[PDB]
């Protein structure tokens, strides 16, 4: 019931509720990215354009913008 | 000799092989104009280099509309 424990328990046991329900045999995969919410806006402040950000690398280019 | 330390930490042209006298003129020229607005961030400096090129082209093209 601590603010460091419970916020890091709901953010992780709630993932298990997303893993247990979704049938991974029926063509499903899920990627897990460790950011923090204050880091992510800084990472959009990092690049001059959203098409060169660090989250753009993991959403677009490592996935969708990739051969195969 | 801290300017030599920045060249040796720059691993692209560190051990005095080629282009080390041109890039030494690049670091020392940017610091002389940096005192108009103090800021410490490379991607803003990638815009602050460009903001020192737009103001430079106002100095050059106004002269090259007079030599022509």
């Amino acid at each position: 019931h601590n603010s460091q424990f419970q916020a890091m328990e709901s953010a992780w046991r709630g993932l298990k509720l997303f893993v247990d329900r979704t049938d991974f045999r029926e063509n499903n995969k899920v990627e897990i990215l460790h950011v923090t919410k204050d880091e992510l806006l800084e990472d959009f402040e990092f690049a001059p354009e959203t098409a060169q950000s660090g989250l753009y690398k993991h959403v677009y280019s490592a996935g969708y913008g990739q051969f195969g | 000799g801290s300017l030599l330390d920045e060249i040796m930490a720059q691993t692209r042209c560190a051990p005095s092989e080629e282009g080390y006298d041109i890039a030494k003129k690049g670091v020392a020229a940017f610091i002389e104009n940096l005192m108009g607005s103090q800021h410490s961030a490379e991607p803003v400096n990638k815009s602050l280099v460009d903001q020192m090129l737009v103001e430079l082209d106002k100095k050059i093209s106004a002269q090259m509309d007079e030599i022509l």
């Binding site: 460091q4 890091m8 029926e26 950011v35 | -």
Partner: protein, 155 residues
């Protein structure tokens, strides 16, 4: 949790599946989602463009949780004594989903390792306690012999 089976062979190898069983399905490029958000107890010093994304399904969730090293270190309130204004920091190391349970949280707190060991010593007493009625006969002897009793409590 392993069924005893035989070596496989050209003969047929029946194994009572005490289990019942499920099924599976498949698609094209799977509907891949990216769950993003704070999953550990700090802020990592590496920039975002170098850290990686890990793929989790039902079979490898116990291995993704173990290799994350979710180490939660915090100072919480001390309610083990008569002090209200006392605090007691903890040290947690999580490797499975059962490490959230109070059996493994209290096992990682040394102030609570002695209290479960206290309870395990009391559950061990209750079995042979009411079976032999000669225990209360020597409780009065320990009521009589007060000097030799306190010399043995320190041991």
């Amino acid at each position: 949790s392993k069924e005893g089976s035989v070596a496989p062979k050209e003969r047929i190898n029946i194994k009572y599946i005490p289990a019942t069983g499920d099924a599976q399905a498949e698609v094209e490029l799977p509907l891949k989602t990216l769950v993003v958000g704070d999953f550990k107890g700090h802020a990592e010093q590496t920039p975002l463009e170098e850290r990686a994304t890990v793929t989790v399904d039902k079979n490898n969730f116990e291995a993704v949780m173990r290799e994350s090293e979710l180490k939660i270190t915090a100072t919480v309130k001390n309610k083990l004594t008569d002090d209200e204004n006392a605090e007691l920091p903890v040290e947690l190391n999580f490797k499975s989903l059962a490490d959230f349970a109070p059996d493994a949280v209290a096992s990682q707190v040394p102030e609570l390792k002695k209290l479960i060991e206290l309870r395990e010593a009391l559950v061990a007493l209750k079995g042979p306690l009411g079976n032999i009625p000669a225990f209360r006969e020597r409780l009065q002897s320990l009521l009589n012999s007060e000097e030799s009793r306190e010399k043995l409590l320190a041991e």
